[PDB]
Design a protein around this ligand. Structure first.
Ligand code: HEM
Ligand code: HEM
Ligand code: HW1
Ligand code: HW1
Ligand code: H4B
Ligand code: H4B
Ligand code: CL
Ligand code: CL
Lengths: 362, 362
């Protein structure tokens, strides 16, 4: 059934992909070659055109993503040729550099060799390529609590964090055949960070907040035509609310709202004063202002939602069904001020797509 | 099958209701009487205890409602005895007066005779007992656009609005047997309104905003044990966001955000300034402040969510499954700052409950 699962997905993908590429006539012949290769090898190999378009379709099908308007301009890097951990590291270093692009972020995905017998060739441990470490012991919380388990795993492997609130985690990944992953410190010259200041409130810098420039998801599986690319890190630029309303604001993350309240000079004593809402707004203004000032790409949730409306319109104009997860698409701030809040979305899974997979640690 | 639908719902309801009331032993006998009455009369009649508890269960089961902690203190008024339009009017007038309670709002439901053969005895046309009229003609929008169709229906029937932005709609309802509904102007001495001022910003009063004190939903059907109470208006007190983030803020309602932006002295030119978010917050602070100052009950979304958490805890402690609609339970402002945002809810329909029904007009 597994090989049958493969061939069925291949048939569906090649048909769709080639139709979109105006290569419909070449489907019959290509499917034959694939059919044979599966019979002989137990799998098949994507052409570079299929791989690139597959990765683009996969972004297009990501129900939780508000930024899908730009699916067709995804920059795809084909690293199916890597065999060594040095090559994997260098490819990850390169992805960070080219995606960052001096602040003018390029949505990029780097694609590593796919699973074979469900057997990974490269197993990435990071959730994102750039993220801050987290610590908890003896009442003291330091850094990003969402990073606590990975951080402790890294520190098993001989890495030691400086225990600032913003330690950059090393890259950590395991090669097929090795029992233990390896880790490499990120070159700081590769990592753009943005200090959070406020356009009007000078004391905001007293909070000494910052965030990294580029979110590069490295823990999802890209599935294209029955082929499982478990190692395929991808990035966009941030929507401000991800940083201001969640990473910095959540009680189980950096939990900064009371401190924000204090520096903007409002009491944090009464629910009816809406101090949390006010703090959220100013913190989010600060995030957008700070990124813009440093020349690092970012989008506000209003512009993003307007782009998403265009994505919806394009979909219908092209005759593609639109799928979406309403619960993730709405921004965590002023959701009812976007059109997304006022309609519904079909949450069906369409492939190609990006999927969660089990962590290799804890 | 219809009578069978009735008996099945009756069996389920009486069992559950009596179990909760510690009247389990009396189920067998009561179900017999009901079984007979259905055979003979084509329906059955609730005892006052069943009716009251049914209405309370129905609130408890309302998946979209954040304010369910107080389900068991619902004030139930039994008006199954009304036969005339004067009695219906007087009962509606009374509901407004006793629910308002000089600003100290009492969650109340008044229950009118139920449908018979699916035939209504009393057909209420209002969406809420107190609501503002809406007009649209020749480019000019006046009042609440959500009221446009009902307003035009009222004006067919000989009513004429003053065409301020806050005309109180008359009560409008039809009696079984009459071809046309009747309407009655609301006595203004019965209707508490709150002028919207801001605690810090004196110019906010220049907007000349107000809202009514008590939301009294009059267009839903209460269903209890297979009995359809189509006319059963109910009220709570407002959560501020309903007024500040929707009624006054929505583009398709009062659309006040630009005016709010101007009076609080911020530009409304750039998405990245988050002026809509800031305007939303100040408008919502104003709403809470204004209601509190006038001694009219209201709750902020933070306190409401804290109460809902207690509702969740009570449910589990009492062994009842909890049902909820995540998409309605999250507040439209700072949703991720409430616990609701961070969990999921089962959206199953449990009866008794309140249901939408078709409008009698347009
Ligand atoms: C170009 C800028 C982009 C923006 C502004 C953007 C925005 C977002 C946002 C706000 C989320 C919600 C995540 C959260 O709530 O934590 C999201 C989720 C997601 N985005 Fe995008 N995105 C972008 C590019 C991309 C790219 C390039 C891909 C992949 C090729 C992608 C795939 C996804 C996926 C798979 C999710 C769901 C992740 C999960 O379930 O954990 N997005 N996006
Ligand atoms: C005591 C104060 C109450 C508060 C603060 C409250 C709060 C809310 C809120 C915020 C909503 C969402 C409505 C919207 O988004 O427009 C809602 C919906 C609802 N509430 Fe409550 N509520 C209260 C009392 C009641 C009572 C007394 C009942 C009935 C006995 C009730 C039944 C419902 C129902 C049925 C809905 C959904 C209405 C619909 O689908 O249109 N609530 N409530
Ligand atoms: C590509 C991209 C662009 C952009 N602007 N923003 C993003 C954000 C990606 C969000 C992924 C992080 O999600 C975490 C934090 N909220 C829920 C949780 C979801 C999750 C769980 C697991 C097990 C893995 C995973 N990758 N993601 C990604
Ligand atoms: C009892 C109560 C207390 C409280 N604090 N708030 C409420 C608000 C009730 C909301 C009902 C109004 O809902 C309208 C506006 N948003 C969606 C729409 C839903 C709707 C549609 C229809 C056809 C009928 C109806 N009653 N409700 C009710
Ligand atoms: C139908 C569509 O999901 C719509 O935007 C919903 C979303 N959640 C909501 N939540 C509440 N409380 N009230 C509403 O009117 C709506 N509207
Ligand atoms: C799982 C639960 O619904 C949770 O609160 C969701 C809600 N919507 C979300 N939406 C976004 N964009 N990101 C998230 O992490 C979540 N979390
Ligand atoms: Cl992030
Ligand atoms: Cl309302």
């Amino acid at each position: 059934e597994e090989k049958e699962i493969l061939w069925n997905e291949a048939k569906a993908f090649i048909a769709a992909c080639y139709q979109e590429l105006g290569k419909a006539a070449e489907v019959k012949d290509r499917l034959a070659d694939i059919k044979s290769e599966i019979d002989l090898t137990g799998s098949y190999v994507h052409t570079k055109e299929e791989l690139e378009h597959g990765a683009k379709m996969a972004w297009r099908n990501s129900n939780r993503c508000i930024g899908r308007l730009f699916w067709n301009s995804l920059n795809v890097i084909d690293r199916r040729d890597v065999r060594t951990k040095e090559e994997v590291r260098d490819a990850l270093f390169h992805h960070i550099e080219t995606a960052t692009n001096n602040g003018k972020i390029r949505p990029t995905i780097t694609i590593f060799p796919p699973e074979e017998k469900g057997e990974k060739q490269v197993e990435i441990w990071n959730h994102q390529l750039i993220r801050y470490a987290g610590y908890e012991s003896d009442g003291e919380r330091i850094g990003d609590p969402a990073s606590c388990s990975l951080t402790a795993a890294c520190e098993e492997l001989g890495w030691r964090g400086e225990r600032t609130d913003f330690d950059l985690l090393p890259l950590i990944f395991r090669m097929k055949g090795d029992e233990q992953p390896v880790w490499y410190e990120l070159p700081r010259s590769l990592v753009i960070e943005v200090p959070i200041t406020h356009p009007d409130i000078e004391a905001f810098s007293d909070l000494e907040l910052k965030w990294y420039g580029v979110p590069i998801i490295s823990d999802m599986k890209l599935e294209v035509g029955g082929i499982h690319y478990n190692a395929a890190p991808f990035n966009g630029w941030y929507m401000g609310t991800e940083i201001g309303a969640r990473n910095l604001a959540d009680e189980k993350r950096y939990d900064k709202l009371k401190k924000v309240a204090s520096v903007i000079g409002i009491a944090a004593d009464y629910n009816t004063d809406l101090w949390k809402d006010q703090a959220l707004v100013e913190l989010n203004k600060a995030v957008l202002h700070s990124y813009k000032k440093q020349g690092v790409s970012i989008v506000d949730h209003h512009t993003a939602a307007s782009q998403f409306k265009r994505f919806e319109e394009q979909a219908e104009e092209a005759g593609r069904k639109l799928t979406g997860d309403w619960t993730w698409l709405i921004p965590p701030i002023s959701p009812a001020a976007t059109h997304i809040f006022h309609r519904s979305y079909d949450n069906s899974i369409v492939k190609p797509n990006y999927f969660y997979q089990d962590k290799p640690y804890e």
